[PDB]
Ligand binder design. Structure first.
Ligand SMILES: O=C(O)C(=O)Nc1sc2c(c1C(=O)O)CCNC2
Ligand SMILES: [Cl-]
Ligand SMILES: [Cl-]
Ligand SMILES: [Cl-]
Ligand SMILES: [Cl-]
Length: 284
């Protein structure tokens, strides 16, 4: 790999067994309890009833009334990278979302969806669109201000100021918004996906000096899983002597120990292969 991975890719392509391989992954994936996610009191904190964090990896809010947020810590030990994957916040969980960003000391938020997709609400408007209209989250005592945005053709980078209204301490949060990645679909090219990923890496947001980057789409599993799988596989291919031993299927199953349903379609799995192959070549 890239040679060994590319060879494997062409073989799967030739036999047309992407769907078969993807289904194998779903069958083999971990099935851990999500008791807390499924408590009655948490019903309104979940966007989709079929998408919940495992108890063992769920992010806990440091709040005395209810610690629950639909978010999971994905800790890739060998790759030496962590991510927080979470659903697109609901109108009632935006305060929670930013409480999590604050408490976990994250530097970046990666958003891979749009607020409305095909006429359906997929994510709350959880950040301010206008500088002069800041957002105040009274429940978690946080204020959020748009400082600037860098709008590119297929993604936007925003500078946000998150302020703890209790202490008046402020932090700069980078918001990386992929705006042309359709739900249950794939990016328009490996190149544009990789350019985006590299921008996130270059920002320092994935650095161990900060808390884990927060990654989300609508459910925090399909597009989110695709993004994280590619990043981790690229790390492995660069850190392993004999990078040929990087088995994307095994890495995805390792990730799914931490959150269910990562990568939601066979074509997203196929795209992950392409991204990793093309990216390996660029980095090598
Ligand atoms: O946003 C994504 O990329 C993603 O995984 N979305 C998902 S996963 C998922 C759903 C959705 C959705 O957006 O409707 C609906 C219920 N089943 C699981
Ligand atoms: Cl949007
Ligand atoms: Cl919503
Ligand atoms: Cl591997
Ligand atoms: Cl699945």
């Amino acid at each position: 790999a890239s040679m060994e991975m590319e060879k494997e890719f062409e073989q799967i392509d030739k036999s047309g067994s992407w769907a078969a391989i993807y289904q194998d992954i779903r069958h083999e994936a971990s099935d851990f309890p999500c008791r807390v996610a499924k408590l009655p009191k948490n019903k309104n904190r979940n966007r989709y009833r079929d998408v919940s964090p495992f108890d063992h990896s769920r992010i806990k809010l440091h709040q005395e009334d209810n610690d629950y947020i639909n978010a999971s810590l994905i800790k890739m030990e060998e790759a030496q990278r962590s991510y927080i994957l979470t659903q697109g916040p609901l109108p009632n969980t935006c305060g929670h979302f930013w409480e999590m960003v604050w408490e976990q000391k994250s530097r970046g938020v990666v958003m891979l969806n749009r607020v409305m997709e095909k006429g359906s609400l997929k994510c709350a408007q959880y950040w301010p669109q206008k500088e002069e209209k800041e957002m105040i989250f009274e429940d978690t005592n946080l204020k959020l201000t748009l400082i600037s945005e860098d709008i590119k053709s297929y993604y936007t980078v925003r500078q946000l100021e998150l302020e703890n209204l209790t202490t008046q301490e402020t932090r700069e949060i980078l918001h990386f918004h992929y705006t042309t990645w359709p739900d249950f679909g794939v990016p328009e090219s490996p190149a544009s996906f990789l350019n985006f990923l590299f921008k996130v890496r270059e920002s320092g947001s994935l650095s161990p000096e900060h808390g884990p980057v927060v990654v989300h789409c609508s459910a925090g599993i399909g597009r989110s899983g695709t993004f994280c799988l590619a990043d981790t596989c690229l790390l492995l291919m660069d850190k392993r002597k004999d990078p040929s031993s990087v088995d994307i299927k095994k890495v995805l199953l390792e990730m799914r120990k931490f959150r269910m349903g990562l990568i939601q379609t066979a074509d997203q799995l196929r795209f992950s292969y392409l991204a990793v192959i093309e990216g390996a070549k660029f980095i090598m």
